[PDB]
Design a protein around this ligand. Structure first.
Ligand SMILES: CC(=O)N1c2ccc(-c3ccco3)cc2[C@H](NC(=O)OC(C)C)C[C@@H]1C
Length: 107
């Protein structure tokens, strides 16, 4: 019911319209490839949109709140790991505003 609306939100976050700032969240952070040695010490519970998508498809979310908690975890990890002036942080804030807008307007 509210879960079905969550699918629409996720689709919005992954759509072309937001690609210029969403693209770094499309896949799990690869610490080795990016050369962030300490990412997995600092970030204990990694998250990204393709993981949210899988969990949605497998019906791992029992309600809208659990879905929101994973999306917020993704943004929180980013703010936690990266300095406040980093470009990826500015990208996260823009994507999060889209997310909090759609989540707040859900019936
Ligand atoms: C989402 C997130 O917290 N990160 C992330 C994730 C993916 C990629 C990445 C790069 C290529 C594919 O994925 C890069 C980063 C960031 N480093 C960076 O130059 O970001 C630019 C967008 C300014 C570092 C950070 C660990």
């Amino acid at each position: 019911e509210q879960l079905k609306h969550c699918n629409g939100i996720l689709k919005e976050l992954l759509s072309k319209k937001h690609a210029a700032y969403a693209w770094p969240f499309y896949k799990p952070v690869d610490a080795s490839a990016l050369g962030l040695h300490d990412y997995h010490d600092i970030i204990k519970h990694p998250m990204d949109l393709s993981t949210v998508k899988r969990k949605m498809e497998n019906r791992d979310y029992r309600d809208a709140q659990e879905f929101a908690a994973d999306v917020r975890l993704m943004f929180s990890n980013c703010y936690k790991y990266n300095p406040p002036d980093h470009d990826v942080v500015a990208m996260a804030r823009k994507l999060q505003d889209v997310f909090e807008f759609r989540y707040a307007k859900m019936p």
